[PDB]
Design a protein around this ligand. Structure first.
Ligand SMILES: NC(=O)c1ccc[n+]([C@@H]2O[C@H](COP(=O)([O-])OP(=O)(O)OC[C@H]3O[C@@H](n4cnc5c(N)ncnc54)[C@H](O)[C@@H]3O)[C@@H](O)[C@H]2O)c1
Length: 222
């Protein structure tokens, strides 16, 4: 099948490499028992979504929970923790990323479960402090559950991994939560719109704000 692969990556050395080389780095540490049953499943250009409707990869609504504010995220995109050119095998492994998540080349996201009224996997401390729920509409990425199947360590997370990061042009919006209570919905003006996307999930009470570089209210964190 055809896949955009690492089109969303912000790290330059991952962006330059061939998909077979990046695929090797993700799968090289997999045990023989895992290799027998599992395959490295990149999200295809046309995929079956969580509500069993066939959509393009860029129309699958992904989400990333993060405590960093819009002034970081809409400026730089999502940069992974490990960006160096010669990482360890633990830092490039998809299975260890899925199982443990120690500092790695991947940026984790979760799929919108559209069969359950746009539910997403929520971390336990989402309602503590200042937290942002970033809305992502990106190409490529590695589907974790499709890859490992029954051997997927935490399938409730519904992970789509992005080795080398996610560019800021694929992030549409961000819901600013203060102790699990919505304050604002940030709008990314540099979002490359693929068309046919549903409206941003918002009440009449919640004020929507268009972001710019060094926004006055756009750098709130713990
Ligand atoms: N982020 C999500 O919404 C999401 C989605 C699905 C699964 N998970 C799982 O939940 C757990 C938590 O993941 P996570 O996303 O918080 O882990 P992470 O490695 O992305 O980051 C851990 C901490 O580092 C910060 N951080 C990340 N990249 C940074 C950078 N470049 N510079 C500075 N700080 C940076 C994050 O804000 C966070 O506080 C993992 O097991 C992950 O697999 C998370």
């Amino acid at each position: 099948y055809m896949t955009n692969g690492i089109q969303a990556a912000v790290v330059e050395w991952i962006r330059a490499l061939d998909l077979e080389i990046i695929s090797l780095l993700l799968s090289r540490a997999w045990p023989m028992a895992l290799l027998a049953t599992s395959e490295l499943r990149w999200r295809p250009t046309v995929l079956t979504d969580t509500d069993n409707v066939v959509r393009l990869d860029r129309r699958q609504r992904l989400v990333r929970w993060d405590r960093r504010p819009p002034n970081e995220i809409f400026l730089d995109g999502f940069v992974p923790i490990v960006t160096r050119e010669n990482p360890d095998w633990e830092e490039t492994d998809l299975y260890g990323f899925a199982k443990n998540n120690h500092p790695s080349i991947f940026v984790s996201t979760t799929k919108t479960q559209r069969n359950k009224k746009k539910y997403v996997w929520t971390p336990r401390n989402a309602n503590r402090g200042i937290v942002y729920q970033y809305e992502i509409y990106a190409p490529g990425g590695v589907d974790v559950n499709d890859s490992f199947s029954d051997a997927s360590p935490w399938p409730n997370q519904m992970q789509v991994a992005f080795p080398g990061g996610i560019q800021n042009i694929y992030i549409r919006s961000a819901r600013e939560l203060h102790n699990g209570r919505i304050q604002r919905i940030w709008i990314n003006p540099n979002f490359l719109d693929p068309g046919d996307l549903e409206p941003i999930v918002s009440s009449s009470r919640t004020p929507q704000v268009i972001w710019r570089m060094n926004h006055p209210d756009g750098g709130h964190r713990d």
